[PDB]
Amino acid sequence: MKPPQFTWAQWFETQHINMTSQQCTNAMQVINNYQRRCKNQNTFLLTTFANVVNVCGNPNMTCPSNKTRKNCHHSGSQVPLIHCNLTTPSPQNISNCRYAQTPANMFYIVACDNRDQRRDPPQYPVVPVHLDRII
Ligand SMILES: Nc1ncnc2c1ncn2[C@@H]1O[C@H](COP(=O)(O)O)[C@@H](O)[C@H]1O
Structure with a gap:
């Protein structure tokens, strides 16, 4: 349930890179206010967007959470x-x-x-x- 103004990459960044506060309750307000639901679980990677894009260059692997998909890294x-x-x-x-x-x-x-x-x-x-x- 991505808000329509965001691309998947932009939504990915919003949920997993741009932790707007080091405190979860504050940071999750952004995600939850965007998707109009309190997400049960959310991981913020203390890494950069560009670092993740380079992980996209790593060898393809099966997505452990989405077994039919091979677009994971x-x-x-x-x-x-x-x-x-x-x-x-x-x-x-x-x-x-x-x-x-x-x-x-x-x-x-x-x-x-x-x-x-x-x-x-x-x-x-x-x-x-x-x-x-x-x-
Ligand atoms: N074009 C896309 N390709 C792959 N995954 C996507 C794409 N767009 C969104 N996703 C995310 O991929 C997840 C699982 O995709 P799937 O393995 O096809 O069920 C969803 O939970 C989405 O957040």
Whole structure:
């Protein structure tokens, strides 16, 4: 449930790269306010968008969360990440959702696709579109 103004890569960045606060409850307001639902789980990779695009250059692998897909790519090393867990669901009032935060150093697996021709910048022809797994 991506908001229509974002490409998949832009939505990927919004959910997994641009952690607007080191505190999950604050950071998740962005994601939840965009998708009009409190996400149960969300990982913020403490890495850069360009770093992930280079992970898209790594050898293709089966997506562990989406077995029929072969458009995934494994990071060559562990990266710091913050994982946000829903601790206070609030379906009838998104703004009151609260999260716990778990810091960790793990690998990630991203699905990558060619860029949205009209809205994604030419600079990156291949872009991350889904965070398939942290492992
Ligand atoms: N064009 C795309 N190719 C692959 N995955 C995509 C694409 N657009 C969105 N996704 C993400 O891919 C996930 C799983 O795709 P699938 O394996 O086909 O079910 C979804 O949860 C989406 O977030």
